[PDB]
Amino acid sequence: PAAADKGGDVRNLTLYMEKLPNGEMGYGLRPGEATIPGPLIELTEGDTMNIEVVNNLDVAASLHVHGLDYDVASDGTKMNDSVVQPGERRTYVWRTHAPGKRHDGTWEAGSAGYWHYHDHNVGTEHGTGGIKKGLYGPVVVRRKGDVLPDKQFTVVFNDMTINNRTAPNTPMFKAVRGERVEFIVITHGDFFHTFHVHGHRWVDNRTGILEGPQDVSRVIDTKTTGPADSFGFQVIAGERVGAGTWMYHCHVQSHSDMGMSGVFMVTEADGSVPG
Amino acid sequence: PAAADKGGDVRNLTLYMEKLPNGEMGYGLRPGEATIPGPLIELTEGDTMNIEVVNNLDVAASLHVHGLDYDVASDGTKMNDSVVQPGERRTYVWRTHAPGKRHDGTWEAGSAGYWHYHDHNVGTEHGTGGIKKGLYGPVVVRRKGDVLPDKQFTVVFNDMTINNRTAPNTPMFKAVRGERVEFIVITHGDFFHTFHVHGHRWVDNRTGILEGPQDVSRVIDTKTTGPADSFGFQVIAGERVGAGTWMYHCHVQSHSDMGMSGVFMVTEADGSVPG
Amino acid sequence: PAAADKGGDVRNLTLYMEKLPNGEMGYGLRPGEATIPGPLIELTEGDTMNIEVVNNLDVAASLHVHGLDYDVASDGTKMNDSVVQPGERRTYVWRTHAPGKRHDGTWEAGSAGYWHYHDHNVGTEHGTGGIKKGLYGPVVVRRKGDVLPDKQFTVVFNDMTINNRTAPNTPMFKAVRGERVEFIVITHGDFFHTFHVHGHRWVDNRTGILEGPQDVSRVIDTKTTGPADSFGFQVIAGERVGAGTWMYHCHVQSHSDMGMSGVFMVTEADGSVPG
Ligand SMILES: [Cu+2]
Ligand SMILES: [Cu+2]
Ligand SMILES: [Cu+2]
Ligand SMILES: [Cu+2]
Ligand SMILES: [Cu+2]
Ligand SMILES: [Cu+2]
Ligand SMILES: [Cu+2]
Ligand SMILES: [Cu+2]
Ligand SMILES: [Cu+2]
DSSP, X not given: OOBOOOOOOEEEEEEEEEEEGGGEXXXXXXXXXXXXXXXXXXXXXXXXXXXXXXXOSSSOBOXXXXXXXXXXXGSOOTTTTOOXXXXXXXEEEEEOXXXXXXXXXXXXXXXOEEEEEEOXXXXXXXXXXXHHHTOEEEEEEEOTTOBOOSEEEEEEEETTEETTBOTTSSOOEEEETTOEEEEEEEEESSOXXXXXXXXXXXXXXXXXXXXXXXXXXXXXXXXEEOTXXXXXXXXXXXXXXXXXXXXXXXXXXXXXXXXXXXEEEEEOTTSOOOO | OXXXXXXXXXXXXXXXXXXXXXXXXXXXXXXXXXXXXXXXXXXXXXXXXXXXXEEOSSSOBOOEESSXXXXXXXXXXXXXXXXXXXXXXXXXXXXXXXXXXXXXXXXXXXSXXXXXXXXXXSSSXXXXXXXXXXXXXXXXXXXXXXXOOSEEEEEEEETTEETTBOTTSSOEEEEETTXXXXXXXXXXXXXXXEEEETTOOEESSSSSSOOOTTOOOOEESEEEEOXXXXXXXXXXXXXXXXXXXXXXXXXXXXXXXXXXXXXXXXXXTTSXXXX | OOBOOOOOOEEEEEEEEEEEGGGEEEEESSTTOEESSXXXXXXXXXXXXXXXXXXXXXXXXXXXXXXXXXXXXXXXXTTTTOOBOTTOEEEEEEEOOOOEEOTTSOEEOOXXXXXXXXXXXXXXXXXXXXXXXXXXXXXXXXXXXXXXXXXXXXEEEETTEETTBOTTSSOEEEEETTOEEEEEEEEESSOOEEEEETTOOEESSSSSSBOOTTOOOOEESEEEEOTTOEEEEEEETTTXXXXXXXXXXXXXXXXXXXXXXXXXXXXXXXXXXXX
């Protein structure tokens, strides 16, 4: 299995905050290529990201990240003077660290995990407006040695939507049976959800993956998730269960009845799927 | 104490889906013996369950399970043609597995845990009407060597009820001080709850029991649980606290004031209780 | 840093239940010195607390505790005849224990953790009115050898407030960069929240501190919390991120927009802060 090498690179990135059709807003890697969710930023403990943010919106907006090391200047809040005016640009710096023992003999936990970034200034000083309209994206921080996936899918429960869509227009994630698949699950907005995926399960720990025989973590297939929670996991697609149309949905009954569901399509190597 | 043996047996079961008084629906081991919750199904990692489901309801209904290994033909969904017409029957198959190393050296987590089954077709294609009316039940999968209880009690928070009842008609669970009692807690429907039991506590891990001196798990007596969450634990009834009428309830205040509570009655050997 | 000694001491405390301005109620260490939250109670596994409760309210009221060992006489409920009439007093006893093996070879988990106490009789038999008006407070139980903090901050999400207040009147917690600070987070009432603090993160286990290399727990900066949930953690203030005005808030967007936020102000040694 492919595994993450040691971290420690300084990386540069540019994000464009752009208007999208029908009043939505998105981050993109190039102008006119903004998506909801925004691009996935992946790094390894020790890496630094210098992210230039270009605001092509009509109102001041920002970039706030969960979990990583940043100083108040990269807070993403008006309060700490960390927002971007229309037509301007600003650099936000994200640092990360490996686990280590402090001089006092206590353990500092590393940066690795499933995280996210989003706007903190549109609509309100908590970014309620920007989050609603699509300004959110995933961040994966690896630890050295972490197993890497073949595919990555991001599910954002944004109020009563999946990635701002409802069924049947929610994303379908396709993989081949046996592929290692990574899910990143983020919740935003005003409501609490339960993420459930048919035919698959994962370990309720940092990686979603059993670490070894002394791992006492619950194995689950449903997880409560509320605004700005983030978690992730990896499955072998179709393991023990075969190819097929596997629903992923919020299991709150009114929510799934109102369209908070989508398809995880696990196919055979030739692309066929039962049904 | 009694501990679960090595699994790997093929077991057969028949469930009947039956109308109950006042528009309710339950699963039963025999016609006319349907209960809410349905019968507890217990197996050990490696065991296979072949479950014949007889539908004596007036609408098509199904059986969907969390956590266990099943193919799309036992998905319990109309989408994968996995439902039972009124007056017909259909066999669903649940497989389970123990933990193990894959070829690529990674670890597959075992099936063991606190799980559940429910309808996925009555009312809506997510089972909203069937779940509402009582079509749900607990599943327990053991790992070999897991400690076994003397009693098992199932608590389902279904919307604003416990097992479709409200106080004072919610179930009283009875045990003698010192007995090993196992609780299985499932939530269904539209709302989020906090399960709490007076005078007792457990470990927030797979078994609810401390695995050993290495186990870093939180020790809790309250837990958030949302639609289709399932967990469970064992306590020694009355340990360190004595016999008594020990409340269990949802700790959301409006919910407890509206009848979401019941009694865990821990008696002396002679059946007496303080008060 | 400082580490907790072994427990096994018997401690005595008096709490006064007192009317507060504008219809609020609080627990206090002296008459006229009640606070919301009530005073923090800290002990070590094996310690016993004898708490004399003086009810100076106009209605019968009580003391109910999570997590610790108590018999039904200290249950705090009317049903177990465990309340205090106006103008009277009553002693509640809390015991605790260390982990250990029972005779049957199973592990009994210890009492250590982040816990809380509240009224269980004012307004309703579940203390709904007493909890609403301010009758709650934190409890910290240590394990022998636990790292001890320099400061303790208690955040109680009580319905749509923090310690019964909204911004700008929510508590400001101050510490110097490098100081070891402890947060205790408790939710009460009718709603679910997600606690988030900018610039800081912790380990989702008993202590909030990484135990060592084998600790598989999710490292997080956001956590769902519902009524009577309690957790806690320690951080090194400003670690990797510097001094600053670091927001803590519920991340439910309407809740934060409606005042569920406050300031964690990390200063330099001389009291200065950026901004
Ligand atoms: Cu914020
Ligand atoms: Cu939902
Ligand atoms: Cu955020
Ligand atoms: Cu489903
Ligand atoms: Cu509830
Ligand atoms: Cu389900
Ligand atoms: Cu209670
Ligand atoms: Cu909130
Ligand atoms: Cu309580």
